Design a protein around this ligand. Structure first.
Ligand code: ATP
Ligand code: ATP
Ligand code: MG
Ligand code: MG
Ligand code: ZN
Lengths: 99, 48, 271, 306, 306, 271, 99, 48
């Protein structure tokens, strides 16, 4: 290949292999905070009501009655507990993917 | 039976049908991305 | 008679220390320090303050010992004491005895680094950086220890602690990432030898890394080739390596700007 | 008939959070504040004491140095002490991986040394800490070893003027975006501190003074200034009193008692609706945890000579 | 062998112009400053005393109220007293003959109330007055009833930092013309005040303290801070001492004397090269011109008990 | 018992005043004022402060009396006491007893004017302005007295004092100038009647001014015609008068901008 | 005249007279501080050395040797006293014009 | 004999002939204007 002209010849094989692998490697997952701490960077949803409000704002959805009425209707009762319970299960599920 | 049905029922009155569906898809997106960007610190925060 | 007051003050300080009146002894230490400095007895004042700080540390008087250590730093600054290995060791020992969560450690570290080779680099002799980093490592403060290593000149300990940190808090998919970052950062600080040695040691010692220059991980091979090119100094090689390994380099975005420095520093790339 | 000459009201008012001890210099602000904090620690779950005075003496009073971050006071499990740091935030450890642009680092630094050198910074720093505490709410109550009347009043006025200026800025906001976000974030806490300082149930001022012309009228001026600031204050600590003994009278103690009795009668006539708690001049140094505890006991229990 | 325990050096140093009296609160800054001013008035052609402390007590000490402009002190022909005014310049009487543009009047006003409300203003105002005095030179010498150690040190540091900032501005001047002219006019006087405050022969600091742990070590900290500021100080006024009498000993006076003797020996050992002048605790209120004169006499003439 | 403290304080104040302890009495007056105001006894506090200020003035305690007068103003402000002629007379008397060179007079005048009709004008009832101006005139403070006259509503006294001021400090060539300025200023404050009366009185009484509407001085004739036109309200007349008399109007440059206001105020000239 | 059209007729004579005088009156001299005090306005040479320096600056004259040497040469001796003496006489002379 | 001659003599060495004459005329102007703008306050200042 053209780039092989400049680099020492014995470097070419490995690089080629890397290239063939690099087009196949699944992208980098989220970085652990441990690794992020080394980086100089520091620019790496609260409750279902706040989540839905953020969703409406991102979608620009106008509430019909009101957002305050929406928040007051639920008030995090037992029936809605499921949501956070779901969260637990979801995160519990993730514990299987990275044991 | 699920948070999705409760949210749909509430949005049926607090938002229009199109707005409710858009908000639902928007939140599904946010949830999926939060799952894609989950880390140990996030798990610790959930524990807290 | 003029000199008698200081002697009587010293005796009173000894008596107070014997009695256990630690705060009064701290105040007497401050007064003696100021009197000695006014007399230009910089070395004697520094020794007295060091001894008093150690004594207060032994008894758990953390704040008093920290204040006396700050006074030691003040003496070093005022007297323009030339940096010496023994003084750096003393400062590192004093910093170690402090409480990790106290800001006094931050202030002491900043002041000591500024005094040590205050002309340029904020490094002193990296021996000080190495000592502080080792103390933090024994304290398992991996972030600050790694930073000091980055500003240190000891790559073997840096590689060992990087292995430990990746094994403990690192992920399976980041094993190479860590070292790569460190290497780049070393090269971002013109310490190519430190980069080479740390990469060698980390590759050799990490169980998940198969020993051998031709590593399975593309990123490690890229880092090795980059080190070789930096030794050579050819810009074309650097550009080729950056371009071919773009998919792996994109794993950590900062790598990109890190590279922007490397070519500027080791290959003459204009800013 | 008169209000009880004890700080029992302060202890009983469990809702009280911010307590300021002030008055003329040398009247015993530090010692009285330490005693009050010690008494509160025996009741409240946790109590803090902050030495806003740039010439901090709580370290001297307790015979135990205190840093700029709250630290456990020796001998107590729920008592913490701190000294306000006039110095601004220390410079962060450089990364210097990228171009060493001085625009940010050098400019911020120079601003920080300049601000630290200016006088008002002292009070400002204290105010900043207050904000932090409102954000934290870590301690149940916090006592202040405030500076003398003047600077103490300056500090107590600072929240209201800052809130008014912030409201003006908001009304003329962007007439940058990160700055606006920070301003919006800060407005709630500044409003909360301003409201709390003006709420009698949340805060009060302890006026410590000695029975003398200068001290008495400085206390009067401070009380009027607080009334202007609408800060509640309903108790005065008369300190360093002298109680002569018929066993062996001496001219010094007798004359001092006469003067202090004149001015104490003046105070009693002047300060109805106040808890005038009278403290004697102890013959021993009030320093160390045990001495301060003993002194606080008579601070809460009215003193009666032999 | 030791330096004479008298302020005779202060009086003899006819070149001295600026005299600062400071220390821990309640040690007697006001009374000692008044006494020193009275003694100087008997020698110098004219002497001024300025109460930079926002809680002014010179009015109380002399039993004669003083305005914000120097006024003759009752009983003396060449003694003047003034209290620094935290408030800024009063608004000029409107002309309102032309369009009533608020841009100037309202903006200046709001700036003035805001600045008056900020804490540092106090010290700033004092500093401003100093500038005026350097422009005027009306009084031969001026004494300062400074605030406690903290704010006093802030004020004493203010000239140097202001001068440095002004030099920076000049070096980056116009990098408006009336503003530049005003800056050029102000630089000479600011430089002169900075130089004078750092000249031992032109100024000195009087450290007044009591024989106690807190007061002693606050005085030590202030002395070190002054040394940092390079402000000369070679005399300390120990005040409110107690001298027991064998005629009728009492426990209070005896114990207080023991404590004060311990700390006075500490001071003597610590403070060689200083004029340690010792003042007793008089059995009468030190207020009014005659009382202050009598007290000043023993201030200059070393006190010796019966 | 609760009310007994204030009574005992009042008795102690009486005793102190009898003894001549004037500063202590001043402090007791302050305390009594604050206690009364806290009880909403605004009128009693104001009367007490007025009496104490007068008493201290009688004994030469200028600063104390000034402070008590400021407290009187504070009471008036806090209680929102409606402006009354008697109160204005009291304030003017208090201001008169002060020392002219003291800034306390400036502060007292500013505060009193602000309280008096604080809604608009900074005038109160000009009766206050008239009284302050008369007091200054008796003190021969012509500048401040003239300013207050300008903000007053008494033109006869203003004309008399203008005559006196021109005769004493004025020049031969400025005799008309003075009155003209005053007249313009009066008209700049919408007080056309005051302008007419002051011009009439000054012309009639000044020896150097020959009595008669047709004055020899062109400026006086211009001012008379301008007053007549302002009464008429015709802009063309104003323009003609301004143009024809330009040489005389140029004697004082401000006249020009003064005129710019007059047409705006009495002839509808846009700004 | 045209301006006579608007004003009442009986005003015309006096104005005319004024006009004929106004073109003849010598301009207004400097105003006394007494009159200036009434005005809201406050924008109404130290020694021969300072006067000459101001003159050179206004004329933009470059000193050949130096201005400091010029100042040092005289130092206000008896011979130069004349200047201030002249001032006196000059001002004394003015005392005759406005007695 | 007069301040003018002294000034001319000094300017003969401290300034060029043309510069000296220009400065002299400039100062004559300033003096004349100061005389034209003389007042009682100016006389008082001279007395001081
Ligand atoms: N009741 C008392 N008996 C004996 N000594 C006392 C008493 N109260 C105070 N003191 C001592 O008097 C001195 C002044 O008191 P303290 O230091 O508490 O004053 P402060 O109001 O905090 O002063 P500053 O305003 O200067 O900070 C200290 O030595 C204190 O120990
Ligand atoms: N030697 C003395 N004998 C008797 N009383 C004294 C003596 N010195 C001071 N006092 C009194 O002690 C009190 C405190 O003194 P003073 O008011 O002068 O303190 P200060 O340092 O000016 O205070 P602050 O810093 O609060 O302004 C006053 O009542 C003063 O009259
Ligand atoms: Mg204190
Ligand atoms: Mg004082
Ligand atoms: Zn006694």
């Amino acid at each position: 290949e053209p780039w092989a002209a400049a680099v020492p010849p014995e470097w070419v094989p490995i690089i080629q292999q890397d290239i063939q692998s690099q087009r196949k490697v699944k992208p980098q997952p989220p970085l652990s905070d441990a690794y992020l701490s080394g980086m100089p960077a520091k620019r790496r949803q609260l409750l279902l009501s706040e989540a839905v409000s953020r969703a409406a704002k991102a979608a620009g959805a106008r509430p019909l009655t009101s957002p305050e009425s929406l928040s007051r209707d639920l008030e995090a009762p037992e029936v809605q507990e499921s949501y956070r319970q779901q969260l637990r299960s979801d995160i519990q599920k993730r514990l299987q993917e990275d044991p | 039976p699920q948070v999705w049905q409760l949210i749909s029922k509430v949005l049926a009155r607090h938002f229009s049908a199109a707005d409710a569906s858009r908000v639902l898809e928007q939140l599904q997106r946010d949830y999926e991305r939060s799952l894609s960007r989950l880390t140990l610190d996030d798990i610790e925060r959930l524990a807290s | 008679r003029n000199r008698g007051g200081v002697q009587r003050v010293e005796g009173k300080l000894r008596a107070s220390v014997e009695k256990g009146d630690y705060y009064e002894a701290h105040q007497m230490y401050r007064t003696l320090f100021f009197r000695y400095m006014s007399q230009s007895k910089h070395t004697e004042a520094r020794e007295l303050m060091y001894s008093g700080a150690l004594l207060f540390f032994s008894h758990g008087q953390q704040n008093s010992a920290a204040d006396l250590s700050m006074l030691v730093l003040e003496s070093l600054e005022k007297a323009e004491v030339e940096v010496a290995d023994e003084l750096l060791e003393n400062l590192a020992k004093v910093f170690s005895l402090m409480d990790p969560n106290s800001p006094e450690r931050v202030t002491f570290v900043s002041r000591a680094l500024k005094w040590s080779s205050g002309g340029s680099g904020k490094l002193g002799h990296p021996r000080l950086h190495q000592l502080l980093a080792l103390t933090l490592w024994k304290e398992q403060n991996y972030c600050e220890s790694r930073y000091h290593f980055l500003h240190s000149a000891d790559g073997e300990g840096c590689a060992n602690m990087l292995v430990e940190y990746s094994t403990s808090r690192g992920f399976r998919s980041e094993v190479d990432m860590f070292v790569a970052q460190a290497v780049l950062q070393f090269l971002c600080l013109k310490n190519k030898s430190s980069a080479s040695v740390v990469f060698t040691t980390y590759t050799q010692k990490h169980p998940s890394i198969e020993d051998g220059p031709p590593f399975v991980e593309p990123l490690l091979n890229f880092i090795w080739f980059l080190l070789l090119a930096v030794d050579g100094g050819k810009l074309t090689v650097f550009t080729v390596l950056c371009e071919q390994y773009q998919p792996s380099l994109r794993r950590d975005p900062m790598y990109n700007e890190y590279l922007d420095r490397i070519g500027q520093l080791f290959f003459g790339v204009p800013p | 008939e008169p209000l009880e000459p004890t700080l029992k009201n302060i202890i009983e008012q469990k809702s009280l959070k911010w307590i300021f001890v002030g008055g003329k210099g040398g009247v015993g602000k530090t010692t009285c504040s330490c005693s009050l904090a010690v008494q509160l620690a025996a009741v409240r779950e946790s109590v803090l004491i902050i030495s806003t005075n740039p010439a901090h003496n709580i370290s001297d009073a307790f015979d135990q140095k205190f840093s700029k971050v709250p630290t456990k006071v020796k001998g107590y499990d729920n008592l913490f002490a701190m000294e306000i740091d006039p110095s601004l935030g220390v410079a962060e450890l450089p990364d210097e991986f990228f171009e060493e642009d001085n625009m940010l680092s050098m400019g911020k630094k120079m601003m920080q040394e300049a601000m630290s050198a200016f006088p008002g910074i002292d009070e400002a720093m204290s105010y900043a800490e207050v904000m932090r505490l409102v954000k934290g709410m870590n301690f149940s109550v916090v006592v202040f070893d405030t500076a003398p009347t003047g600077h103490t009043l300056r500090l107590l006025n600072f929240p209201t003027i800052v809130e008014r200026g912030l409201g003006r800025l908001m009304q003329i906001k962007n007439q940058a975006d990160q700055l606006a976000s920070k301003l919006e974030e800060t407005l709630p806490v500044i409003r909360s501190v301003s409201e709390q300082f003006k709420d009698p149930e949340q805060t009060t001022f302890i006026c410590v003074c000695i029975a003398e012309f200068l001290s008495l009228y400085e206390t009067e001026r401070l009380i009027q200034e607080l009334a202007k600031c609408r800060i509640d204050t309903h108790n005065i600590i008369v300190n360093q009193l002298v109680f002569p003994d018929n066993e062996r009278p001496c001219k010094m103690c007798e004359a001092r008692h006469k003067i202090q009795s004149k001015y104490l009668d003046q105070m009693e006539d002047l300060y109805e609706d106040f808890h005038i708690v009278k403290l004697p001049l102890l013959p021993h140094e009030v320093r160390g945890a045990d001495k301060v505890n003993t002194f606080s006991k008579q601070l809460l229990e009215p003193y009666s000579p032999p």
